[PDB]
Amino acid sequence: MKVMILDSGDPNGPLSRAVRNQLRLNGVELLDKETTRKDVPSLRLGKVSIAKDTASVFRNGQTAEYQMIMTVNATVLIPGRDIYPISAKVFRSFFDNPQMALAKDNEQDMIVKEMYDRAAEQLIRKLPSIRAADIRS
Template sequence: MMKYRLLLSFSRLLVLSVVLLSISSCGFQLRGSQQFPEHIQLVEVRSLSAHDPQARALAERLPVYQLGYTRAAAPADIANTVIIELRPENLDRRLLSVFRTGQVAEYELIYRVDYRLTFPGQEPVNAVVEVLREYQDDPDQVLAKSRELDLILDEMRAEAADRIIRLMASQASVPAVAVN
């Protein structure tokens, strides 16, 4: 019985080691573990409004990726600053289902952010992020559903910010193309 337990624990350890080695050898990285080049340390976020909620979401998410945030980079920092220019956000709803009475029961929320990403010494890249969520509407609980919609929208902004930063990380690793 003792040999069986020892053999079982050894085989589990062996299987775990093989799985970990295969995952690490294929280049797998956890989300949020993107590495930025050494020269990129600061992100300037520009938006039309000083109190843009998407700009706030980016400001909250950038420290997770060990990046600094600024609303206007100093001239001395411009060589290591990535610029994100946010355009106005857009929230649309698409009807998914209705009650027998004809009232809307469920929506699909579509949150869209257009932005321009500019790396030092490179041409700007225009991009779009779209985040989708399902939202169930209940006409009997208007106040609670209004608060729920605000929370869902905040989550969608945070997810959009993460996607923007991940795209920025993937674009940062692409070498700059020399223009003659």
């Protein structure tokens, strides 16, 4: 069985929740707290940034779609090896006015949520096993 430590500043934060969930889905066990930390790798969640901008506009110059970009920086600490930085970047667009959208879309609430899932998915995918040492970038 795989294990690791999650260092979350806010365990209630959407990113943490997202990563935790992701980890469980990929069968990585979280350890409660710190002991044998010289044994298990830990994932530490760093900077997250979310940007929003007009992705497209109508003939009238007004905004049609928005583009959101979510950036997540983390580090993996494998005992005995160096801090291993990783990151995820998620792009997402949506129509400001749903009536202008051909397809049904979720709330902007869920849209941001979904980005957290995708970012966490990404971060999980980049996690080395016990068996490696990788170089940046």
